[PDB]
From Swiss-Prot:
UniProt-annotated location(s): Nucleus; Cytoplasm; Melanosome; Cell membrane
Summary of the function given for this chain in its UniProt record: Molecular chaperone that promotes the maturation, structural maintenance and proper regulation of specific target proteins involved for instance in cell cycle control and signal transduction. Undergoes a functional cycle that is linked to its ATPase activity which is essential for its chaperone activity. This cycle probably induces conformational changes in the client proteins, thereby causing their activation. Interacts dynamically with various co-chaperones that modulate its substrate recognition, ATPase cycle and chaperone function. (Microbial infection) Seems to interfere with N.meningitidis NadA-mediated invasion of human cells. Decreasing HSP90 levels increases adhesion and entry of E.coli expressing NadA into human Chang cells; increasing its levels leads to decreased adhesion and invasion.
Name listed for the protein in its UniProt record: Heat shock protein HSP 90-alpha
Residue ranges of the region described as Interaction with NR3C1: 1-208
Outcome, altering E32A: Strong ATP-binding. Strong interaction with HSF1, HIF1A, ERBB2, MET, KEAP1 and RHOBTB2. No effect on interaction with TSC1
Portion of the full-length sequence here: 16 to 223 of 732
Length: 208
């Protein structure tokens, strides 16, 4: 069933900085996740060009943003490439060890925290708003996995069967108490218009 792993010391530190550095432009987290979703979708398009069969698991290439005010979660879903157990475990397929280092080198020399994603580690910006992140994923070459973390130094991976998802990645953000603004329809619309306005894939904003 559940496996628990430690974050590489460096990522544990990056996460820590995000959680513990005072920085109020928290909204950028949405841009960064949306920007991973876009890339993930880029990858599935790229392979499909040579191999139509890769989109047997779904033809549509899009992003859903799903607020749920009851559970207090913001879910970002794509039908992009997904991650294998191994990518999941390895820093969710980022070059996070090298990218973290640079980011901090770059932080000492005039970079703010919103530059995070220029270092390939935008994912962790989730922790600006989220107390706990669950990432469900399905890659064509593997089964469905759930990854989970509330920082603290550890993450867990387990396989996942409650609802198959064909192909893609579902980043579930359980918001901190004081961050429920990110569940308001007008706040999400404003953010998407302001930071992810022009992007290669449709974004549906679910209503409640």
């Amino acid at each position: 069933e559940v496996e628990t792993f430690a974050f590489q010391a460096e990522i544990a530190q990056l996460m820590s900085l995000i959680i513990n550095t005072f920085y109020s432009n928290k909204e950028i987290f949405l841009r960064e996740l949306i920007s991973n979703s876009s890339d993930a979708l880029d990858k599935i398009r790229y392979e499909s060009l040579t191999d139509p069969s890769k989109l047997d698991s779904g033809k549509e290439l899009h992003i859903n943003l799903i607020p749920n005010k009851q559970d207090r979660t913001l879910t970002i879903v794509d039908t992009g490439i997904g991650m294998t157990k191994a990518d999941l475990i390895n820093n969710l397929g980022t070059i996070a060890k090298s990218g973290t280092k640079a980011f901090m080198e770059a932080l000492q020399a005039g970079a703010d925290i919103s530059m995070i994603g220029q270092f390939g580690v935008g994912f962790y910006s989730a922790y600006l708003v989220a107390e706990k992140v669950t990432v469900i994923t399905k890659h064509n070459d593997d089964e469905q996995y759930a990854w989970e973390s509330s920082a603290g130094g550890s993450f867990t991976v387990r396989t996942d069967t409650g609802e198959p998802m064909g192909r893609g990645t579902k980043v579930i953000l359980h918001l901190k108490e004081d961050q429920t603004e990110y569940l308001e329809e007008r706040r999400i619309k404003e953010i998407v218009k302001k930071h992810s306005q022009f992007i290669g894939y449709p974004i549906t904003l679910f209503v409640e």
